UniProtKB/Swiss-Prot annotation, chains A, B:
Reported function: Bifunctional enzyme which catalyzes both the conversion of PGH2 to PGD2, a prostaglandin involved in smooth muscle contraction/relaxation and a potent inhibitor of platelet aggregation, and the conjugation of glutathione with a wide range of aryl halides and organic isothiocyanates. Also exhibits low glutathione-peroxidase activity towards cumene hydroperoxide.
Oligomeric and partner information: Homodimer.
Sites where the protein binds glutathione: 8, 14, 39, 49-51, 63-64
One Gene Ontology molecular-function label: protein homodimerization activity
Reaction catalysis annotation: prostaglandin H2 = prostaglandin D2; RX + glutathione = an S-substituted glutathione + a halide anion + H(+); 2-glyceryl-prostaglandin H2 = 2-glyceryl-prostaglandin D2
Subcellular localization(s) per the UniProt record: Cytoplasm
A Gene Ontology biological process term: response to selenium ion
Cofactor mode of binding and number, as noted: Glutathione is required for the prostaglandin D synthase activity.
Protein name (Swiss-Prot/TrEMBL): Hematopoietic prostaglandin D synthase
Keyword Cytoplasm: yes
C-alpha cells in the first residue's frame, strides 16, 4: 500500500533483514544503495546520523531491528502469540549480540583479523551449540512456522560463512534451517536478484 | 495476574528496565538477585547461559529488551500507534547501542578506564545532542505521554552520571526529562526502595 524508500550502503549488512521482510511480504520499495564516497554528504541529514533508514510517507524511521519489528507487526513473521513474539525477539537479540562483537570498523587490519579469528574459533561454537539446542528438532526456531528470526539466522550465517567457510560443519540442523529459509520462493528470488556483495 | 520471577545480579544493570515496567504497572514479581559467587552454579541451567531471565508460569524468557517489549504490549508505554511504537523501539535501540560500547567486562583496568574516558568525552556529546534535538520541546520522547523509552533514558543516564557526574550539565532538557520520570509516583517509590548499588 504505502511507498517505501530504504537507504543504506551497497551491501547486505544491517539493511538485509528489512529487504528479506519486504521480499516475503511482496511489498515494493525503493532499494536506494549508496557508495561509501557519498556517505559524507548524506550523514548530516539523518536523525541520528546513521543508516539504514526507511522513508515512509515522508517520515524517516531508523534502527534496523526497530524497523523490522514494525514491518512484521500483525503478521505471522513476528510470532503468533505475545509469548512467541518475545521468543522471536530474544533470538534476534542473541544473534545480534554476537555479530556486534565483530570490530567491522577496525582500522588496524592486524588486530581486526586477529580478533575475528578469536571470535570465530572461541566464541562461535558456544553460540552455535545453544542455538542448535534451542532449535532442537522444530522445523523453524519458533515451531512449525517461519518467523523473521529464521530470516536473521540466514542473514547472519551468510556473512559468518564468508569469514569461516567450515563454521557450520558440525551443525547439520542449523544448516538445514538456513537451507529451508533459502528455499522459500520469495527469498530464493531475492537471493538470486540481490547484488553480489561480500558483506 | 500471573506470577513472575526475575533473575539477575544484585544491580540495576540490564534488568532495571524490567523492574521499572513492573513498578509502573503495579505488577508483583519476585526480584531474585544473585551474587557473582553464585553465578557459576546457575549459568549452565539457563537457555543461552545469560541473565536476566523471566520465569513466567514455568517458562523462561530471556533478553531484557525482548522481555520489556513483551511486558509493555497492549499498554500505552509501548506507544499508542504502530508508528510511535517503532519510534519508541528506535530510541531504546539508539541508547542501548551506546551503552553497549562500554567494555563493562574489561579485565585490563587500565585500558578499560581509558576507553570509558574516550566514550564519555568524545562520543557521548554526539549522542546527547541528537537525543536533545529529538526530544525538542515535547514533554516526553514520543510526545505528551510517558513510554518505556523515557524509563530507559532514566536508567541509562543514572549509570552514565556515576561515570561522569557533570555529563548532563549542558543538556537541561535531558535533565528535566529524567527528573520527570523520577517524579512519577510508582517510579519514585521504586527508586527509594530499590537496593543502593553502583551499576
Ligand atoms: N543498531 C543500528 C546501528 C546503526 C549503525 O551503526 N549504522 C552504521 C552502518 S552499519 C552507520 O550508520 N555507519 C555510518 C556512520 O556511523 O558514520 C541499526 O541497526 O540501524
Ligand atoms: N543483550 C542481553 C545481554 C545479556 C548479558 O550479557 N548478560 C550478562 C549480565 S549483564 C550475563 O549474563 N553475564 C553472565 C555471563 O555472561 O557469564 C540482555 O539484555 O539480556
Amino acid at each position: 500500500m504505502p511507498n517505501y524508500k530504504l537507504l543504506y550502503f551497497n551491501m547486505r549488512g544491517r539493511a538485509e533483514i528489512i529487504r528479506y521482510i519486504f521480499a516475503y511480504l511482496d511489498i515494493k520499495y525503493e532499494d536506494h544503495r549508496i557508495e561509501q564516497a557519498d556517505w559524507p554528504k548524506i550523514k548530516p541529514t539523518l536523525p541520528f546520523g546513521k543508516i539504514p533508514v526507511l522513508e515512509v510517507e515522508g517520515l524517516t524511521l531508523h534502527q534496523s531491528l526497530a524497523i523490522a519489528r514494525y514491518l512484521t507487526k500483525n503478521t505471522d513473521l513476528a510470532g503468533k502469540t505475545e509469548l512467541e513474539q518475545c521468543q522471536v525477539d530474544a533470538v534476534v537479540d542473541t544473534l545480534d549480540d554476537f555479530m556486534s562483537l565483530f570490530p567491522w570498523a577496525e582500522e588496524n587490519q592486524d588486530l581486526k583479523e586477529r580478533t575475528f579469528n578469536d571470535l570465530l574459533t572461541r566464541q562461535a561454537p558456544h553460540l552455535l551449540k545453544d542455538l542448535d539446542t534451542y532449535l532442537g528438532d522444530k522445523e523453524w526456531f519458533i515451531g512449525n512456522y517461519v518467523t523473521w528470526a529464521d530470516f536473521y539466522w540466514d542473514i547472519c550465517s551468510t556473512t559468518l560463512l564468508v569469514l569461516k567457510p567450515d563454521l557450520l560443519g558440525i551443525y547439520p540442523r542449523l544448516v538445514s534451517l538456513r537451507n529451508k529459509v533459502q528455499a522459500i520462493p520469495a527469498i530464493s528470488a531475492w537471493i538470486l536478484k540481490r547484488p553480489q556483495t561480500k558483506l
